[PDB]
Amino acid sequence: MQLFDLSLEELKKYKPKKTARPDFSDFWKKSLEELRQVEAEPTLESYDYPVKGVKVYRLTYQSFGHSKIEGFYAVPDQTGPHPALVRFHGYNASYDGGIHDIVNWALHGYATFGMLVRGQGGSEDTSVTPGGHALGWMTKGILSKDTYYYRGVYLDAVRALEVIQSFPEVDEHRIGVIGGSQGGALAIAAAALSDIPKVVVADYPYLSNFERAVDVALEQPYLEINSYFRRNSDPKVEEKAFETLSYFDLINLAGWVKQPTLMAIGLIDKITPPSTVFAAYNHLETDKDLKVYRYFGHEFIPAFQTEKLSFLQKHLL
Template sequence: MALFDLPLPELRRYSPEVPEPDDFDAFWKASVPSGEALVEVRPHSTSLRLVDTFDVTFTGFGGAPVKAWYTRPAGTREALPAVVEYLGYGRGRGLPHERLTWVTAGYAHLLMDSRGQGDQYGSGGGTPDPHGGAPGGPGPVTRGILAPEDYYYRRLMSDAVRAVAAVRELSGVDPTRVAVCGNSQGGGLALAVAGLVPDLAAVLVSAPFLCHVQRAIDITDAAPYGEIVAYLSVHRDAETAVRRTLSYVDGVSFARRATAPGHWGVGLRDTVCPPSTVFAAYNRYGHDDRTIEVYPFNHHEGGDAHHVARQLDWLAARI
């Protein structure tokens, strides 16, 4: 894909006024459950001798159980800094040996399953979405999209906040040193958590989904935004309701509220999460310690393994 969005000098200055609902904070305060999060932590047998793996269940939105993999360096007993990781669109938590970067770097690692996802890529998931009966399209991004109270991402973002509460309750975690990370949908979730949890140690966001959403659905037909476009092409009278719902999950609003150092990544040829939507959130990010890695010739994969190396160095310098 050729460059299609704003030139990089304009992107670095791009900071539009993205309106948010007057009751944004009240909405999210009412959405996220409180109280203890952990339900069950069971040792999980694998053939990996250098890590210890646990099958975790915690309570998410509406009290529903959410699954996660918890891994830590084998045999360690001290309280470690933790990284909570969120998944891309359509993925479930898969198998416990699939994501080992953070644990082999010495962190405790919690990989949150995405409720009602896991059927498009990877190795599946294990968390149903029992609250998904409201009108909307078939894909996660359009489920319940006619009202913010019913919207799928209200539930998933609430789960993401609860994952931080859960990791802080786990044995062998230093609750003062918790970072969140993710790419694409996972980046959008990490950014939401950055705006909803006030005492994170760090935030790592790559190609975040659901930023400056109103612009995204106007300039790209690539999925997942293309699913919203397709929905509106059929439900022609739903645009006002849909745009209102999306305003409650926009990453620009969460970015304004962030209070932890932030490391970002963006590919300038990314049609999935267009660069201007990423910079719209980055340029509003609420902490002065922020940096964005720019990959001019890359699409949604961004810097890929090169970017992960930069994330590891950046996070090690902070926690």
């Protein structure tokens, strides 16, 4: 592929005005309160996996809307407490719960839980579908911040941290949140809504600068929003949709992140355009660093893996 978004020089300076409504923090305050009203009631069931030195489990817990969230949980097979990681998977990109990577994270020394995102890689989503929406999760319940798909997801992410930190074999002071694109977005959103995480690693975070994303993205899933408007021409629906999205946009959440953060971005990424990622990064006011990779897009970036491992090792291991 090739360069397409703003020049690197412009990207570094790209910092769009926040779109957060006056009731932004109030919405998250209320949302967190509804989550708190749901007892976690976590369950742990051992799971066989052909690995030595790691114990794998299937973890489930109750979250927003009384939804049962799941994911594999791998723990180093040695005395703890262990530093932990809550890993979030990409949009519709979870295969068999990403169990093999979860196990490898545990082999690296981290008690790791790969929270499966509602209705995607796993987990239950009790939230009702208010009405029509484009193919996908991007616009489900988009006409209201209370019904929006990611409201439950973000909360599940926070609840995931609360459950993990409660584990006695987990060192609550050494918990990191990581993920790619959608996963990176959940990581950042979790760090913004909970102070449990110590550090944050986000690979080309998704759900960022929506109003620009729909005009710059050249591939799914941002375009699901575009597809949604094509099916609902009502001008008010568009205003409303973007109004809803602002409550979940990383450029509005970034400011709450106080944890050391490591981000990555490929300049030829057509799914999460550089501009939208730099936008999130430029709204972060915390110990941070953005690794830029000229020749990579929305994919695994080997050089960034080293960075990631090194960063987590330094702050947690």
